[PDB]
């Protein structure tokens, strides 16, 4: 019933504490082949798979508004990372999964959102982050958020070393509460996987 | 979505014509920082103005333009990506002074499929290619811009004036005299 | 334009933007989009420089701000030759089937 | 068991 | 003609509307050397101006004309081959001063089937019959010419500014302020 | 007529001095998917493209029997090389092109061959190298040899860091002759491209 | 011109 199993490549993630999958803005991808690539683009499926990253430790001291961010893509030491150094242009979506594991005795709430064209938000703007593809994480209800977003931006293809369209954001909505039965803190991890990965301008070898 | 029917009420009919994006953005707005040589950049609109704030309440946008310019001497427009030196030649769209001002229709000329109000990276500031061209004249006194056929994508925060009164933001509303 | 007794093997490569300096050797450039050819009965060869950029259009002019070219480079290498020391390779350029120019301007100083 | 998002 | 298909690419669709001869030549250009009595000669356009250079990039041409003249007193036009003395009489097309200037449509009146931008021989200089007539007024302040229904024949060299930098000709391209 | 244009990926080679293409042992490839990979193998086309390597300088002093070899695969600083460090198992064929450019006034002959399971050959064995997929290069006739071989070996997939099945071999059959009109020496280069590239066991990042 | 081995 409430048990979801996500699979990207030869990697899977089975979440029992899931609310569902939120698809941001659209469920389809703008044609990966446009006039800016002159039909010289290709798809690299070997890169469409999960990679992990620890975001932060959610503690009782962090109040409302505490915000942590992770601009994508980040340094990747795998196949995807190899692509970034071998090609001038790339484009891809993101299958994001964020988990804050504690126990049913913890209280509190986290907002998990994917933001296009990140900009530092002011205290007041934070009250409206729900305008972006998001999902909440509350111990009593779920320990895993799951968001899926497509590629976008002014350009059909991008140079990730100069611009990062999507930015993962996690913000404390209501501080973590603890009992004598609860967990003391909750470590928030991210399980991310790039989607519909396409490369275009093959670069020379650096030697 | 919940309705008043939950407790015996009856949901009424709504006319959302005035909150239609194309309609609301379709009006003239001022641009305050002007120079004899000016590059048309919509982000130069006031951040709290009806159009300025709504524009900033979106990530990506597209629209053609219509502008009004009160100038001295002849006005010359040049498209996105043109050398600044070009503004000196009549071969480019040039409008000869006719009081009280000049009103023109300009097409979107950026090389991108759409533009952005925020850009996370390098070309802080936005890329230089995010413009509708440049205009030049001996002196430019006023500039009004109007977004025609506007399209907005990916909404972002939009804020009202913050309240201190701890209950309601009160202000003088128009009312008859005597 | 060499004589019949001169043979040569060349390579042309498109180096997209994103690298600090152009490849100084065919080996390094081989990983880029490239073409290699012989000089025999047909002394003429043609290569298409592909449009590969983020935007759907590109500027024709170059801004003073531009340090490294925005659209990349084209490199012409000589793999090797046989008795072609004084012989030359004439290069010319034309528009491709899908080449397109838009937004006319009068830029020259008048 | 449950739903799959392959 | 070779294409990117040779190595796996895909040729795209092209819109050549802006490089259409009739379209590109169809715009107003200045004529700098003016006199109270002026013979309309398209070769008097600037050699590097959008229209001037493109015109010179052709051997033979044909087109009707449209002109704008800011003058003092009344303007009188006379056709190709007319005696200069005729410019003094009202019987010839004469336009009475009406601010801010006068805009007229003139037909090609040369006795040749087409005109040339270069002529190898004697009638250096071009034959006197290569003109669109003459105009006269007390004073002629400005003159804009426009080639209508233009036709060009036998292309000739067209040059860009020469480069010294040994790599690329760089110049200030328009971009937002701040 | 005698003009051949080979294309592998976004790279091409147009040879006017060609004798033809020699396909070694077979024109087909043994099923890339076997029981040893449990259906976890994939094809990486981004790696099937040309890369160059200089073999040696053919001079008048080198006599019959002079042999030069290049074991494949060699160090690759491109996409293919990335694969070798990201996967435990690989398999692929080779589209090989060797060119010795001089001029119609040079005399002499070279033997170009692809050898499975290379072993140092004795002077006597060299008289029989024609038992392997080969082609000759003689200035009066051609300046380019072109051989295409499939993958093979006791194992369906290989670990190239421990074993190199194919080995390119070039041997002088008849020494280079020179006139006053000929070239003084001929530099032999190789234009190689891996084919039907498949990878299997994805390795972790080295950091 | 000639044969192709794409």
HEC string for F93-106: EEEEEEEEECCCCC
Q: Which of F79, F202, F206 sits opposite A86 (nearest CB)?
A: F79
Is omega for the bond preceding A73 within 30 degrees of 0, making it cis?
yes
For residue E25, the chain B residue with the least C-alpha distance is B91
d(CA A90, CA A156): 9
Q: Would you call E51 an interface residue with chain B, using a CB distance cutoff of 8 Å?
A: yes
CB interface of A with E, residues 6-65, below 8 Å: 33, 35, 38-40
Please give the Cα distance from B95 to B90 (Å, whole number).
Answer: 9
- Chain A residues within 8 A of D6 when measuring between CB atoms: 5-7
Residue F24 near residue F150 (C-beta atoms within 8 A): yes
Q: Measured between alpha carbons, how far is B66 from B56 in angstroms, rounded to an integer?
A: 19
Helix H, strand E, coil C: the string for A30-77 is CCCCCCCCCCCCEECHHHCCCEEEEEEEECCCCCCCCEEEEECCCCCC
Domain positions in chain B: 1-178
Tell me how far apart the alpha carbons of residues B123 and E151 are, in angstroms, rounded to a whole number. Answer: 42
SS3 percent helix, strand, coil of chain G, rounded to 5, is 0, 50, 50
The structure tokens 């004795």 sit at F122
**DSSP per-residue letters across chain E:** ---GGGGT--------GGG-HHHHH-SEEE--S--SEEE--GGGS-TTSHHHHHHHTEEEEEEEEEEEEEEES-EEEE-TT--GGGGG-TTS-EE---TT-EEEEE----SSSSEES--SS------TT-SS-EEE-SEEEEEEEEEEEEEEEEE----PPPP-SSS--B--B-----
Q: Let me know if C71 is exposed, middle or buried by CB neighbors in 10 A (0-12, 13-18, 19+).
A: middle
Give the tokens for residue F165.
Answer: 């099945």
Distance in angstroms (rounded) separating the CA atoms of residues A106 and A115? 27
Which of F135, E107, E21, E161 minimizes the C-alpha distance to C110? E161
Given the DSSP bridges, would you call strands B139-155 and F67-71 parallel, antiparallel or unpaired?
unpaired
**F117 backbone φψ class: left, alpha, beta (φ>0; ψ -120 to 50):** left
Residue F174 exposed, middle or buried by CB count within 10 Å (0-12, 13-18, 19+): middle
Distance CA A206, CA C98 (A): 32
E33 Cβ neighbours under 8 A, 6+ residues apart: E44
Find how far residue B111's CA is from the centre of its chain: 19
Residue E43: is it exposed, middle or buried by C-beta count within 10 angstroms (0-12/13-18/19+)?
middle
CA-based nearest residue to F198, from F157, F150, F164, F148: F157
In whole angstroms, give the CA distance from residue A162 to residue A206.
Answer: 19
Q: What are phi and psi of F197, to 5 degrees?
A: -75, 120
Q: Which token pair is B107?
A: 């097409």
Which method resolved this structure? X-ray
Question: CA A186, CA A178: separation in Å to the nearest integer?
Answer: 10
- Please answer whether residues F77 and F189 qualify as being in contact, where contact means their C-beta atoms are separated by less than 8 angstroms: no
d(CA F148, CA B120): 48
Number of Cα atoms under 13 Å in the Cβ half of residue B163: 8
Cβ–Cβ contact A46 with F under 8 A: yes
Cα–Cα distance for residue pair B159/A128, rounded to 1 Å: 9
F127 three-class SS: helix
A198/A157 Cα distance (integer angstroms): 9
* Alpha helices in C26-103, H assignment, sequence order: 26-29
Q: Is B82 on the interface with E (CB under 8 A)?
A: yes
Answer whether the bond into residue B100 is a cis peptide, omega within 30°: yes
- Comparing CA positions, the residue from E130, E158, E145 lying closest to residue E55 is E158
**Beta carbons of F203 and F83 less than 8 angstroms apart:** no
The DSSP line for F148-176 is EE---SSSSSB-TTT---EEEEEEEEEEE
Q: Is F14 exposed, middle or buried (0-12, 13-18, 19+ CB in 10 A)?
A: buried
Cα–Cα distance, A74 to A70 (Å, whole number):
8
Please report where in the chains the tokens 């005696």 appear, as a residue.
E83
Alpha-carbon distance F9 to F50, whole Å? 8
CA F36 centroid distance within chain: 27
| Upper half-sphere CA count for residue A137 (Cβ side, 13 Å) | 31
At residue E86, φ and ψ (nearest 5 deg) are -60, -30
Burial class (CB in 10 A: 0-12, 13-18, 19+), E108: middle
Q: Do E12 and A38 touch (CB under 8 A)?
A: yes
CA separation, residue B131 to residues B47, B128, B156, C71, E99 (Å) = 17, 7, 21, 21, 36
Nearest to A92 by CA among A157, A46, A154: A157
A39/E13 CB distance under 8 A? no
Q: Is A130 helix (H, G, I), strand (E, B) or coil?
A: helix
For residues A53 and A189, give the distance between their C-alpha atoms in angstroms, rounded to a whole number: 6
Is there a contact between F16 and C41 if contact means CB atoms under 8 Å apart? yes
| Cβ neighbours of residue B62 closer than 8 Å, sequence gap 6 or more | B108, B113, B114, B115, B150, B151
Contact call for F51 and C45, based on CB within 8 A: no
Residue F168, CA distances (Å) to C87, F142, F148, F162 in order: 32, 19, 11, 18
Sequence length of chain G is 6
Nearest CA to F129 out of F191, F172, F188 is that of F172
Which residues contact residue B67 at a Cβ distance below 8 angstroms, ignoring those fewer than 6 apart?
A: B40, B103, B104, B106, B135, B143, B144, B145, B146
**Which residues are CB-neighbours of C21 under 8 A, at least 6 positions away?**
none
> Rounded to the nearest 5°, which phi and psi values hold at F160?
-55, -20
Enclosing H/E stretch for F195: strand F186-199
Q: What is the number of other CB atoms lying within 10 angstroms of the CB of residue E21?
A: 14
Strands F42-43 and F186-199: antiparallel
Cα B2 from chain centroid? 35
Structure tokens at B165: 């009164």
- From E124, E35, E49, E44, select the one nearest E84 (Cα to Cα): E35
| Angle A34-A39-A43 from CA coordinates, rounded to 5° | 90
B104 touches C at CB < 8 Å: no
DSSP bridge pairs for C37:
C10, F14
- CA dist F66 → A168, E75, F110, F177 (Å): 62, 93, 10, 15
Q: Which residue has the tokens 């003249």?
A: E69
The DSSP result for A143-170, as a single string, is: SEEEEEE---SSSSSB-TTTB--EEEEE
Give the resolution value in Å: 2.9
Phi, psi for C62 (deg, rounded to 5): -120, 130
Partner residues linked to A176 by β-bridges: none
d(CA E165, CA E162): 10
Which phi and psi angles does A169 have, rounded to 5°? -135, 135
Alpha-carbon distance of C52 to C72, in angstroms, equals 9
Among positive and negative, which fits the CA dihedral A56, A59, A63, A64?
A: positive
Q: CB of E38 within 8 A of CB of E44?
A: no
What is the DSSP-derived secondary structure letter of residue A89? -
Residue B164 touches partner A, C-beta closer than 8 Å: no
Flag if E176 and B41 touch (Cβ within 8 Å).
yes
Interfacial E residues in 142-161 facing C (CB < 8 Å)? 161
If one counts every other C-beta atom within 10 angstroms of the C-beta of residue C16, the result is 23
Give which of E105, E100, E108, E1 is closest to E62, Cα–Cα: E108
Burial of residue E36, with CB atoms counted within 10 A of its CB: 0-12 exposed, 13-18 middle, 19 or more buried: middle
Binary contact (C37, F52; C-beta < 8 A): no
Tokens for B66, please give them: 């219509």
Q: What is the CA radius of gyration of chain E?
A: 21
For strand B102-106 and strand A144-149, is the pairing parallel, antiparallel, or unpaired?
A: unpaired
Q: Which two tokens stand for residue F92?
A: 């692929």
Angle value at C-alpha F182, between F176 and F183, nearest 5 degrees: 70
Look at residues F112, F117, F22 and name the one whose alpha carbon lies nearest to residue F67: F112
Q: Could you give the CA distance from residue B74 to residue F178 in angstroms, rounded to a whole number? A: 76
Of B83, B109, B113, the CB nearest to C61: B83
Instruction: Pick the residue from chain C with its C-alpha nearest to B89.
Output: C106
User: With contacts defined as CB-CB under 8 Å, which chain E residues touch C105?
Assistant: 50
CA dihedral (E19, E106, B78, C73) positive or negative: positive
Inter-chain touch G5–F21, beta carbons under 8 Å: yes
Q: What H or E segment, with its residue span, contains residue F144? A: strand F144-149
Is the CB of residue B30 less than 8 Å from the CB of residue B142?
yes
Full strand arrangement of the beta sheet holding E37-39: E37-39, E134-136, E75-78, E94-95
Taken in order of first residue, the domains within chain A and their CATH numbers are 1-207 (2.60.120.20)
Measured CA to CA, the distance from residue A148 to residue A135 in angstroms comes to 11
| Break positions in chain E: residue before each gap, C to N over 2.5 angstroms | 123
Tokens matching residue C15: 């180096």
Q: Cα separation of F56 and A175, whole Å?
A: 71
CATH code for the domain defined by B1-178: 2.60.120.20
Number of C-beta neighbours around residue F171 at 10 A: 20
Task: Round to whole Å and give the CA distance between A174 and B39.
Answer: 45
| HSE value, Cβ hemisphere, 13 Å, CA-based, for C70 | 16
State the CB neighbour count (10 A cutoff) for residue F153.
Answer: 14
Whether residue B143 contacts residue B34, with contact meaning beta carbons closer than 8 Å, is answered with: yes
Is residue C65 helix, strand or coil?
Answer: coil
Least Cα separation, residue F22 to chain A (angstroms) = 30
What single string gives the DSSP state of each residue in chain B? Answer: ---GGGGT--------GGG-HHHHH-SEEE--S--SEEE--GGGS-TTSHHHHHHHTEEEEEEEEEEEEEEES-EEEE-TT-BGGGGG-TTS-EE---TT-EEEEE----SSSSEES--SB------TT-SS-EEE-SEEEEEEEEEEEEEEEEE----PPPP-SSS-----------
- Dihedral over Cα of C53, C56, C60, C64: its sign: negative
Using alpha carbons, list the distances in angstroms from residue C50 to B99, C53, E5, F141, G4. Answer: 49, 9, 10, 36, 21
Task: Inspect the interface and report whether the beta carbons of G3 and F3 lie closer than 8 Å.
Answer: yes
- Report the alpha-carbon distance of residue B101 to residue B72 in Å, rounded: 9
């Amino acid at each position: 019933d409430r048990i979801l199993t996500t699979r990207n490549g030869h990697t899977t993630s089975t979440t029992q504490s899931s609310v569902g999958v939120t698809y941001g803005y659209s469920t389809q991808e703008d044609h990966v082949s446009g006039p800016n690539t002159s039909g010289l683009e290709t798809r690299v499926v070997q890169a469409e798979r999960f990679f992990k990253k620890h975001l932060f430790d959610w503690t009782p001291d962090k109040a409302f508004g505490h915000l942590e961010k992770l601009e994508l893509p980040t340094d990747h030491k795998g196949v995807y990372g190899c692509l970034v150094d071998s090609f001038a242009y790339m484009r891809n979506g993101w299958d994001v999964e964020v988990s804050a594991v504690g126990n049913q005795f913890n209280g509190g709430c986290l907002l998990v959102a994917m933001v296009p064209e990140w900009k530092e938000f002011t205290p007041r703007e934070k009250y409206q982050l729900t305008l972006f593809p998001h999902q909440f994480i509350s111990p009593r209800t779920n320990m895993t958020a799951h968001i899926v977003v497509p590629y976008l931006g002014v350009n059909r293809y991008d140079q990730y070393k100069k611009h990062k369209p999507w930015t993962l954001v996690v913000m404390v909505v209501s501080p973590l509460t603890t009992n004598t039965v609860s967990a003391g803190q909750i470590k928030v991890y991210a399980n991310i996987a790039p989607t519909h990965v396409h490369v275009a301008g093959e670069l020379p070898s650096k030697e | 979505t919940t309705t008043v029917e939950n407790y015996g009420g009856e949901t009424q009919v709504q006319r959302r014509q005035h909150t239609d994006v194309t309609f609301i953005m379709d009006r003239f707005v001022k641009i305050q920082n002007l120079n004899p040589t000016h590059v048309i950049d919509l982000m130069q609109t006031h951040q709290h103005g009806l159009v300025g704030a709504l524009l900033r309440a979106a990530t990506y946008y597209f629209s053609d333009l219509e502008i009004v310019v009160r100038h001295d001497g002849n006005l010359t427009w040049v498209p996105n990506g043109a050398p600044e030196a070009a503004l000196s030649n009549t071969g480019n769209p040039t409008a000869y002074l006719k009081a009280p001002f000049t009103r023109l229709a300009l097409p979107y000329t950026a090389p991108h499929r759409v533009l952005a109000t925020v850009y996370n990276g390098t070309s802080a500031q936005l890329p230089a290619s995010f413009n509708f061209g440049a205009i030049q004249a001996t002196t430019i006194h006023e500039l009004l811009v109007r977004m025609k056929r506007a399209e907005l994508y990916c909404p972002r925060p939009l804020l009202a004036v913050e309240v201190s009164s701890q209950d309601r933001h009160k202000q003088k509303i128009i009312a008859p005299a005597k | 334009t060499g004589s019949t007794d001169s043979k040569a093997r060349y390579m042309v490569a498109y180096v997209p933007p994103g690298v600090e300096t152009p490849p100084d050797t065919p080996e390094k450039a081989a990983h880029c989009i490239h073409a290699e050819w012989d000089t025999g009965l047909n002394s003429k060869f043609t290569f298409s420089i592909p449009y590969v950029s983020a935007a759907d259009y590109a500027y024709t002019a170059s801004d003073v701000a531009e340090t490294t070219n925005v659209q990349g480079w084209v490199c012409i290498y000589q793999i090797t030759h046989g008795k072609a020391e004084q012989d030359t390779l004439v290069v010319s350029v034309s528009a491709g089937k899908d080449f397109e120019l838009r937004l006319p301007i009068d830029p020259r100083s008048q | 068991f449950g739903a799959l998002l392959a």
